[PDB]
């Protein structure tokens, strides 16, 4: 059995302009003390990091801003931030509501 | 290729997880949870689909409206994922297996467990 | 590491009772360029598929319309329109918004 936590987070910012993001995170852990990570952490980590997305030109700090790259681009920090014995799994991150990429490790 | 049935249904329950050695604050949520189950498609389908919710909600019913501290010792969604998880696997019919359960406490915080 | 792009769209039909369907489909890709695959050119592959089903009696087109076989349906309409470099990852399809089958390739 595998045991995940996961969060829900969302920011604007705009590329090429200007969409809504609803951004999902899987952790992969053991369960330990009854939990596999604390949910504000993880929420506190995600936020950090989108908080450099939020209402922004992506195409400065991105070459390419496309759903797939911003997507890499925040699983790279997410996993940079997270506590040991956790891994980062899945990242779901949607532009629109119907329009999205899943990258699973 | 696998093929699964899946059922979402929802409960409400209070709950205060441990914030130290001592507990926390009291506070209610609707609980949503999705439970895929695994199977054949034999005759056109897996799995009856009330079937399958009349399992399932025969066990959240054990949860909905309670105060889940005085149910768990540690009422983490994690906890009562596994629980729901063991009772649901317990009943299920000898063709279908328990593939994954998903539960949110809310809309934007949950757990998965997957087999 | 895997990676896709998702497209949800919805449909209502009938089998005989009538409901809306909601579709999600994910397609299994390298990135290559920034993105797998454009959403655009998906969602019309997707839609040119669904639209055979909407406001029809799915018992006029199917000798057993459940929602497994629905889906499995569209699964190898989808699978023989896409693109060289990619693949049929996972359809799911919602009769309403409380049940639905899944189908991972």
Partial sequence: MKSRIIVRTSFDA?????????????????????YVMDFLELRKIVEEITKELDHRNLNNIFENPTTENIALWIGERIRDKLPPYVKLKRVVLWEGKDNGVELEW
């Fill in 14 to 34: 705009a590329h090429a302009h200007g969409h809504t993001f609803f951004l999902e995170v899987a952790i992969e852990g053991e369960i330990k003390n009854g």
